Amino acid sequence: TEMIPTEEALRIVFGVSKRLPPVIVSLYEALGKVLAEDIRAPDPLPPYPASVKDGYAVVASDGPGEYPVITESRAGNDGLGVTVTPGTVAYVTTGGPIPDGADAVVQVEDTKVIGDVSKRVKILIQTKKGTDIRRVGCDIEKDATVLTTGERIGASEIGLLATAGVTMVKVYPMPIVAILSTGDELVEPTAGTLGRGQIRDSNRAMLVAAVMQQQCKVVDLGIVRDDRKELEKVLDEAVSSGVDIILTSGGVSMGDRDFVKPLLEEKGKVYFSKVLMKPGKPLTFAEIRAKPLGKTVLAFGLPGNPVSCLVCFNIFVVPTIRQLAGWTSPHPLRVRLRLQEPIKSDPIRPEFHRAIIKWKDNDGSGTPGFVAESTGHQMSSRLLSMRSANALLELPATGNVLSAGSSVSAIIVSDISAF
Amino acid sequence: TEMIPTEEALRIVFGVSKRLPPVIVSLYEALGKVLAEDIRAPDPLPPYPASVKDGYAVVASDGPGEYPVITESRAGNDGLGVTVTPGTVAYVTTGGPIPDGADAVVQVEDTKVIGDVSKRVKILIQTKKGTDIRRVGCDIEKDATVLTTGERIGASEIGLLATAGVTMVKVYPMPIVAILSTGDELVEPTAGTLGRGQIRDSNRAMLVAAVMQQQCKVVDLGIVRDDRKELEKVLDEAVSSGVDIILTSGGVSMGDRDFVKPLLEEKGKVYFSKVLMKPGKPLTFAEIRAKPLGKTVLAFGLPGNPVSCLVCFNIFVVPTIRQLAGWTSPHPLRVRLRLQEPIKSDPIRPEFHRAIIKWKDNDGSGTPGFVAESTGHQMSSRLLSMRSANALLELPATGNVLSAGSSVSAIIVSDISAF
């Protein structure tokens, strides 16, 4: 067969893909990236006894009654005020330091201001010691590890970094990706009336947007014609430019002008060039060593057909991006769902059927789960099959018609928030 | 109770949130945004009879045998070459125009080159007319609508825009969001040794990263102290700056220095300020009209506690962002999952329990599905409960202990690709 299964091509790319060296970035540059160090709190949270509620800090043993407001301790006070002796209370807001001597905080809804212009308040409930008080370090202990290496940084992790005072973060960067399209029939997407035999370059803009969705820097190398020396020149510039991944579209098939596959066999080590899969078949993966520091560049000879180009990106390039970016779980999300319509599977090649999936309270069998609708015809040239497709149905090469209501595996390729 | 349920607060914000006027952006600026017009193909795809395979364009009636290669039609040729008469073939690559007279294409694996230096090839199979030929418009018909209004633009949609030659796209923009934190105890996250009663501002950096994850422009207004005139000045500048959403952290509780809620009642129309929910309770939503063009600004008085601040962002601000951005389905993804551990629900307030959910081939009952682990203590001040939390368990106010293995509803707040 010469071609390898998709599970083996993934294992080969996984074994070659190496995590990028960590870098130091600012707080907002660290969003979305994977932590490359442990984060320890230099001080506890809260660093002082803080009030949970707005109200009055009391002595729990005094109980209900009328007491003078001996002092006020709002959020922002230094806490070094008057000691709340038994028989006295202190007004506190949320986050306000608990004055020395207070054992609990009574909610302001459980109090009543007595008198007017010397202030006295009436505690209306009997509270126990420690009520509505955040002890020192109750949320975050001092020197405790709030964030560990390998953890991806989201919005909550950014707040934890700001809580610990970390504004320069050591993370694993995103790979720089160079993208180019091959084909003498390609013209820029700005072209109006097409010439004879000309089509607009769709893969390059598609791969650019796809790499952008992976939060990687894109190096647009433009349209390259089906010329051996030209493709060799662009690849040498791409390898020496400092990129980590090179994405090529087209030129890896069986035509006598497909120079992407041979050139990758010449400049680097091609691990495979054909994969048993639907859609498509040609897919060249090579490891190129930049000749100088010394650097390894991964090359993905993606097929020229728009569907196979984007599918091979979602299955092989996306995990390579995350693995280089330091993800501990680079694999995409895989779920089980029901089929909303009958689908005929290929008898030879396991198909990655494009589908629009959604969560239903009744997936067709009385239980909540995912259901998938087919996007239509699945030819590798019909980019409309990728339109609004958020999952890839992993159909096995059985040749049988999977009726509606059967369960298949699906690779989710984007957030499916469309309820 | 004075406070309204979460379903009603969402209905109020949904009824006030208005979609932003459409703008014209470039191709790469249109990524992630919602289409505000229909996209029609100015020319078919392919615009010419294109070969699917690399091989030879033949006359299907001639059948197998030896034939001369009368011409070559690779990808990039104008297609106005020599007519392939019966008894002749033409070499074609993938995307190459089909010469006039050819009815089918024979795969090069089904051919053999005969002779050498005049070229002759041997067709080894009997093919039917139309095999391995992309007819004009088979993938995309001319004047057909490839993209419709209200469709969010992903990588595949970008390729469709480049296919149709649309480099300037009419989309609905993202709202500009202004963010500020309130609190006399707040210091910048760059502060080292904290002073007495000081904590580092975590909500602002957290909300900035959260709004950035929504692909919105952030207007950082910084830390504002608990001063009535100061907060009034910052809000007047924020309303007149041109932002669409104002996010405030803190100053909406019961303390005598909480000026966010009263000021929003003064400059705009506050629709609610307390919500029946856990964590938290105070949450002020107001609509402010910018006094000049005329503009409506939505204000979210988020609570100061870090957990309640981020939770109220995920439930109320995120759909408001998407609704302003033109999303037809602004609601977050809601699924059903099993509990990996027993959880005690609040008897009064329905809780949004932070959880780390994952898809398992066996969710604990023999069927594949989602399972959720609790993040630990769910106090509104313990931001560690938000750490790596990707779902919000919608626990009902029943006071009963939901044992492990029971099914609850969950709001997914980020892509859960962690397999």
Ligand SMILES: [Mg+2]
């Ligand atoms: Mg080609």
Ligand SMILES: [Mg+2]
């Ligand atoms: Mg406050």
Ligand SMILES: [Mg+2]
């Ligand atoms: Mg998801």
